[PDB]
Design a protein around this ligand. Structure first.
Ligand SMILES: COCCOCCOCCOc1ccc(C(C)(C)CC(C)(C)C)cc1
Lengths: 302, 301
């Protein structure tokens, strides 16, 4: 069922204790190990905590299109280092700038603070982007896993507050419903790459109050028909062997029914994380869909 | 379950009788109704009938070239009905397309279309350079019945030790003409392609069920040793499609045998989405059509 490269990776980490457990490391972001880009480090004096860290990445040589990217890692891990591979791929394929939001990780904060940090950073980009050489009117959203929850959350908050939506949104195996368990939870309870236990752990740090999980801002899969019908055109990519697979597909079908242009693609033989884990990302299906994502940002953002 | 555009297409034709029935339409290929590429009509003195017609399309040193084998149940299709997909492929891939206009059933039957396609490829390999294309940078593409033909030509290349393409794309392919698979039961008349249409096509192409067991007819049933030598392959499949299982199983089989094989399922769409003009503009269809072209572009150099 799994392709050899993905199977080899799964075998190599079956031996590893899960990192989603106490005590948490104090380093939450690190490198996993040809396209060049510039980096501007931004401390934005905005949002619930008074600061949001953002990195603006631009390809080398009028206004560049820009992808606001919200990284995954279960709201506990990740940052510019661990996502360097995906950011590079996005920049190589899309030709766009990447606005990478380095929001505060759990449990230093909890829902809805990372959501509002991401939302506030986007509002800043909208106002000041032109001065950094990007075109805020040509904006994409991207997010993977927990970042997919954040991407769709920020979209929903934009709809609620009547602030600009991106032209195009990509959700990669997104978490869309933190409250309910879906069919694939049962099908792949610890099926490699992501286990039901890791999911519960991440959800307990990000939304310690289970009642929070029912809110549409936490779980955009539970948003109203009226709000979701206003979503930007969206591409959803899911891994086949993945407890969280059902959430993305159901969310996409829901967008389709409501008249949003939404494409949904299932990649066979791969697992959660294939877009950001270097080893997984070189397998045929993963590699193909990663360049599709970048290619589709290139086509949508002009 | 289907996206609005695809659902509307399915509804608009739900009252129409299947075209896979007698009497057959007298036109077997027509426009669904070029300035982006040139067209050269080639009469190749090859194959069991002594002729194979091929169209060489070139976009605006040597061009990469995609040998394309069209679908239509072996009974229908040709350059006219595939004008939209070919146009898309050329735009997105930037490659030339060698479109094999093989003889349709039942004027001929298996294995003549297979052998026509194989022989047209051998001609391209020998003469491509003088046509301004690079035979060492070749792709295979095929949809549905054409996916049977594409994987059949690959299998024949291996058996006969002739050059393989660098990259192969199978779009909702038929890979096994002998067996009914799980999705036959799940979508027996699920729109776009029905189980009756499947058995109808097979009755003209392979009237003798024993032919269907042959690996050349059904590459999904080829030996491990042959399949392990397949070129790098991307398989794209529609979700609501009786034949969905065949493409997915074939890909899993290539993956296990150590061939680099990607398999992608497009949700909310049906058989034929890559060549039917209306279906091809829906989000999922459109994305995967550009994916296909885009990956030919990246693979062919
Ligand atoms: C009159 O002009 C019509 C020609 O265009 C129709 C064909 O193009 C769309 C593809 O439709 C099909 C439908 C069925 C099939 C077959 C029957 C080959 C599927 C199979 C082998 C799984 C039975 C192939 C293509």
């Amino acid at each position: 069922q799994l392709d050899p490269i993905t199977q080899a990776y799964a075998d190599a980490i079956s031996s590893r204790p899960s990192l989603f457990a106490f005590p948490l490391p104090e380093i939450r972001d690190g490198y996993q190990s040809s396209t060049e880009f510039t980096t501007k480090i931004l401390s934005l004096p905005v949002g619930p905590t008074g600061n949001v860290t953002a990195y603006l990445y631009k390809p080398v040589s009028d206004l560049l299109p820009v992808i606001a990217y919200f990284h995954g890692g279960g709201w506990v891990f990740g940052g510019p280092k661990s996502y360097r591979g995906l950011i590079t791929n996005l920049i190589r394929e899309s030709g766009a700038a990447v606005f990478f939001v380095d929001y505060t990780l759990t449990p230093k904060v909890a829902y809805p603070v990372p959501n509002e940090q991401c939302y506030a950073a986007v509002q800043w980009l909208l106002e000041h982007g032109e001065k950094l050489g990007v075109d805020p009117t040509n904006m994409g959203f991207g997010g993977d896993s927990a970042g997919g929850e954040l991407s769709s959350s920020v979209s929903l908050l934009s709809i609620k507050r009547k602030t600009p939506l991106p032209k195009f949104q990509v959700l990669i195996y997104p978490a869309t419903d933190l409250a309910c368990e879906s069919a694939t939870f049962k099908e792949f309870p610890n099926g490699p790459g992501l286990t039901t236990d890791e999911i519960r752990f991440a959800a307990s740090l990000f939304t310690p109050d289970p009642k929070s999980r029912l809110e549409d801002v936490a779980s955009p899969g539970r948003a109203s028909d009226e709000d979701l019908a206003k979503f930007p055109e969206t591409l959803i990519v899911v891994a086949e062997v993945d407890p969280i697979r059902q959430q993305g597909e159901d969310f996409g079908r829901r967008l389709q029914k409501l008249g949003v242009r939404a494409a949904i693609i299932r990649v066979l033989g791969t697992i959660h994380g294939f877009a950001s884990i270097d080893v997984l990302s070189e397998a045929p299906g993963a590699k193909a869909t990663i360049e599709l994502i970048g290619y589709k940002f290139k086509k949508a953002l002009h």
